[PDB]
Amino acid sequence: MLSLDYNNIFIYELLTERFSSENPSSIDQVVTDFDGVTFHISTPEEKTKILISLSMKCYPELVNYGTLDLLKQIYGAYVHEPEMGYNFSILIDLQQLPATDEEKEQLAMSISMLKRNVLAAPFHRAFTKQAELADLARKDPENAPMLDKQATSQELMAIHYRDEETIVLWPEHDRVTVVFSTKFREETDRIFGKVFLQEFVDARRRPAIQTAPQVLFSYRDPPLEIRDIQGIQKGDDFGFVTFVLFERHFTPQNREDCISHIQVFRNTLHFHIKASKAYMHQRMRKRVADFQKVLNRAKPDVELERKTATGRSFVRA
Amino acid sequence: MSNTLRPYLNAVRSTLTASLALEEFSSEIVERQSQPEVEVGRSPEILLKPLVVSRNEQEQCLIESSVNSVRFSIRIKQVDEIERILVRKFMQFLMGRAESFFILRRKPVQGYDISFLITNYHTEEMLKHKLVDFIIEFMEEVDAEISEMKLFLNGRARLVAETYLSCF
Amino acid sequence: ETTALVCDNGSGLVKAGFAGDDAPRAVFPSIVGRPRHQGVMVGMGQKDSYVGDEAQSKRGILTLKYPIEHGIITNWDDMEKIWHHTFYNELRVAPEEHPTLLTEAPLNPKANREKMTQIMFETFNVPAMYVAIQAVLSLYASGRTTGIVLDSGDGVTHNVPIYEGYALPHAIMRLDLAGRDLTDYLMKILTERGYSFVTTAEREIVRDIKEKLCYVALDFENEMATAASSSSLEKSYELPDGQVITIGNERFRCPETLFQPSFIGMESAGIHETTYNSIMKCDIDIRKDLYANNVMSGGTTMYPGIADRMQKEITALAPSTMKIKIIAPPERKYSVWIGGSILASLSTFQQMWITKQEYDEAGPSIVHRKCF
Amino acid sequence: LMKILTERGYSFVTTAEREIVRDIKEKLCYVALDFENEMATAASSSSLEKSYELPDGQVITIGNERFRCPETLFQPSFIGMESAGIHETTYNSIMKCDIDIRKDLYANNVMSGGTTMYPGIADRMQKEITALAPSTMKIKIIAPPERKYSVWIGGSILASLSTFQQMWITKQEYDEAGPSIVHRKCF
Amino acid sequence: ASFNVPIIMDNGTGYSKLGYAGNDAPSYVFPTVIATRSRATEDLDFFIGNDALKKASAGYSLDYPIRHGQIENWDHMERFWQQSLFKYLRCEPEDHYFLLTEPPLNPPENRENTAEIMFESFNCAGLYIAVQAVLALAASWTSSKVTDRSLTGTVVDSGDGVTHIIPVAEGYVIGSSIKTMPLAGRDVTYFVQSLLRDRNEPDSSLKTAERIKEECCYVCPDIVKEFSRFDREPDRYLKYASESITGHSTTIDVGFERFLAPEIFFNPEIASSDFLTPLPELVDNVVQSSPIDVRKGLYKNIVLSGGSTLFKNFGNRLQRDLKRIVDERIHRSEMLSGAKSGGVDVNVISHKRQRNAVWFGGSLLAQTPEFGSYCHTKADYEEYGASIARRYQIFGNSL
């Protein structure tokens, strides 16, 4: 696979099986996801009632960012009071699901896609702010730079979802710039990530893919706007990949795909580093075989009599 | 490869072909048994002095001989740590299949990355005037492989970056 | 250090060797080809990709792709493969023990230069490297110090006037018509006589046809009128298939694309008008010397009689009071290399390298502020 | 199509069977919207199998060969050609043009010729050109139902024009200019 | 501090059962097969499990990395692990502890390769290797609250590729008594396919044989009496509906295979000449070779495991045969001596988690706090080298 999936496959399959089934069964399984997020599935009250919980270390910051309302108008009346040890909880009963199959399938997909659904609140807020500044600047072109600066100052938003990762996003009259504070431990991971990040920068440059958002990466130094932001170390070992999303990159027909893509970026990079390790393994063995071919000299020709198959010559003559 | 490694390569060739005058010899401490004397090192009167060939501080060729067995360990260049990881993994794969090589050790001596071990029997049955040919051929081809594999790493990183980024 | 590497990674051909030598140790086409069939045979040493002379020899069952397009590298994988070939398979010298010299056409994107420098420094770990322009190399080779250089090659044609020790960057004219476009036009206009060339092997065959037969006339209208009475102008060529083909007015028509770019449907001045404009863009006090020193360089300028026709057109354009002289050494095919080697074998050049210790402390942008 | 019919078990060698195979391709062959998914669907050969009645009365059945041979247009490597598909060639021809004239080239594609009458060729070409071309603008395919004789219709229209009569190549010009009048008169 | 939940891997010959510690069921139970070819590069165009099964004729060639319990090809195994982890299991290796399992009697080289792949390609926090059995003993006891652990018995783990009879006494596994028969569900599946072959049934696909076992096969007391009963009784002649790909209502008339297939376990001569000792006799030899004091515990508790022990009347027949043999020996001793005895009873035990007893035992074991201390930490691997796990411990004494 080349592109990482955008939701939890186990939740999707479980929901599909339990919706299409006729005899439900009690289940209690806790499932982990990428980036430390953990999901818990249980049926404590009724065999036909399923409760799903979300765990995330940065969730209170999401609440500060205004994610409760987004979750509410995303998931309707399904909202349920959170369970112990978890952040967001949902309770679903199979007796009230829509009869039509496509509604059930889309509900299962939406529930399985809870990760980005809860993580996309800052992106939606940034898009709304970008629209506001766009219309305000269209009201008077001469009033752009000062409102742009005040938006870079006040609306500068940030989040820490991993302890070596950070998203810094802020809107403007025409763009929503985002900064990733990438850093890889596990030395060999950082070793391969250096090459991966270098090649990832070049990509955009090539005229072949100029339609993509502009990338900006420079290790050992952060951009001008985030040196004063708390949490950003003074370039200890952290890279900083910056994507500039213009108006065309979040057109009303392409917002969700862009959000999911920009969210999954880092996990894609990690998984593909591992895939590159496997690629080495296979090539390296594949032509150490050629070295063995080179060695197979220095063996005088000899003759084996039959050695027919799964046995020893199967005959005395 | 060559046109570049003439003196080091020829010195290794000459030393190896001089050090391969092996002989069948039993064990002087255990009866009705024969062991490679270079690996045990219990009877010093039959162990020729250890010999080292080098071209630069990062390339060495330790040549330890004996009456029946010869162990020959080398170091190959690792200019940057990318080549360090590549060399380590590749040479591990190389030694992992020593069963079909007959002149390899499953684990190199410390401070090295590979150790050949030519016991008498290999010279007894396998004609040995091309074992050294394989030795030198490998000593150059290995650097060739490391360079090629780092090129392939760069290429695959470029391909995955383009594939990820184009789908915005 | 004894000697320093130097590589002229041109669009069509690549020239490599040691500094101070007077002969290319290695010249092979800049071609990387992949197989396009199954291979029901057993063994044969199935090689995934053939590059250089091997690809040129086995083009029968391969599809060939040029990594460099119009002077800008577009397939960095193939470029790295070609550099690896030059380093290991033909010159067979360790990159880490030899400073290298590279060549890049003027006005190329800065991405090309930065990526090339970074690749040479990190993937090959060369001790030091330098990037130089073709026109400066041509002047170094010719022994001159003043004179506008016309460098027409496989990928791009550019003009860089240079006074005594100084270059005028504002008067540099770059034209994207070159040998590849000429070969494409020859393929297009060989169809009108029946012969059809499609695959990349046919493209190489047409390139050989242009090598052996194409030439530049003196007066286009008179030459066409002479070709109308097609008696003593046609020639013949032998394809590897054994079939003999006849060449006619298109023998000299396709070289005229340089002087009349409208033949391939591009709105631009010819290789003489661009030179005239480049000279006129310079200061008035140096035109009287730039006219007397017209330098021809590159593979494309090897057509018979191109120098005479270019001199005629430049003399017609320029005022008659000042004479026009054009020069083209018989070894101008490797003039860029000769200048590169002369520059690399200079004592005063030793402190103008870019060492690894200098590179890693400033990033890949150092090449922009040091090389040029 | 003749070459790939052999693997099923039917042999068509000489010219008569060549015309028979041509008639088969007239009524059975079609262009799939996508190739890999349709090839996978061909395993469940339920809605893909079709029957044809030869002049000899022997009935033959055809499966994935319905859309395998029309795909050669988009994949010329099947018959052993190192060329690009029709969509790729059209995109390259558009790209080779000038910068500001690509608006109408993208917005106006004329689908003419007898071979362009396959069921679903226009949709596949539209999808492919949309994929290659930038997504900023729209791609349109003009496929008139009478595109089979479009060349003749246009020829009649041109000949009926009241300004074309001056451009005729009269025999008087040929009587003095030789057979080369057509080179510098027509185009 | 508070670590993440451990992950319970399982790589059987036929099925691989991933999951988590503390769960009540494996998250994924899918076949151990990977699809592979021969503009995505050929490095990544691979599918595993049910996706590989469905995508079989679309341009991929399936291959089973594990056969007879031992891994032969390593590219397939490593690609299987990476696909599982990063596609279905959805975990980051560096922040979790793994509990791998693999059949006993494996070469130390295989364990070394597994450890080095896990700590280099992935480099997880810790890796622990357990023997397919053990976990079976752990999952044997159902109401495991504080005390009611048998901790002494025999586990007959019969699976897809190879079966293992391993005795356990007071927790420790007696190596000298370990014996293994190289016949399992796959060999009898090939036998069923051959039986379909000889009768020239319209469909003879291997999946058809698997389903024929799934809803048809059962164990019988003896073969000649069962043949006579089948001749007399005519309602034992079923016709399984196949529907392979397009052959609607192509019913397959099953026959004597329904009792001829399971009999290989109690009569291994049919499968091949590589083994000839019937399973009850082999279990008797295993128990007798054990130390004298633990024979009562070995006979009293016998635990079935694996998916190939789900045959009806399998446990009944095994218990009957073992009880008959032990009675024969005891009575022989009695008439040799001339005194009565209380005898020894045999209780072959089957439980509600027969199919995935190994996984359930692993999940129950991983939850213990002391499990973390037993894992191979990454620092130990980077210090002592890649041969940290080569000393084979459960069966046989090193040096």
Ligand SMILES: Nc1ncnc2c1ncn2[C@@H]1O[C@H](COP(=O)(O)OP(=O)(O)O)[C@@H](O)[C@H]1O
């Ligand atoms: N004698 C010749 N006559 C005509 N064309 C030539 C001749 N020699 C070379 N060429 C053309 O010039 C090209 C050589 O390009 P080259 O000058 O090596 O490019 P660069 O200067 O970028 O290295 C070839 O592709 C060939 O088509």
Ligand SMILES: Nc1ncnc2c1ncn2[C@@H]1O[C@H](COP(=O)(O)OP(=O)(O)O)[C@@H](O)[C@H]1O
């Ligand atoms: N109900 C059943 N009855 C008999 N055999 C079965 C049954 N279900 C599965 N089997 C077979 O027994 C094997 C054992 O299952 P499992 O333990 O998951 O495999 P493995 O031994 O590869 O780990 C299955 O792979 C299958 O071939």
Ligand SMILES: [Mg+2]
């Ligand atoms: Mg050049």
Ligand SMILES: [Mg+2]
């Ligand atoms: Mg098993």
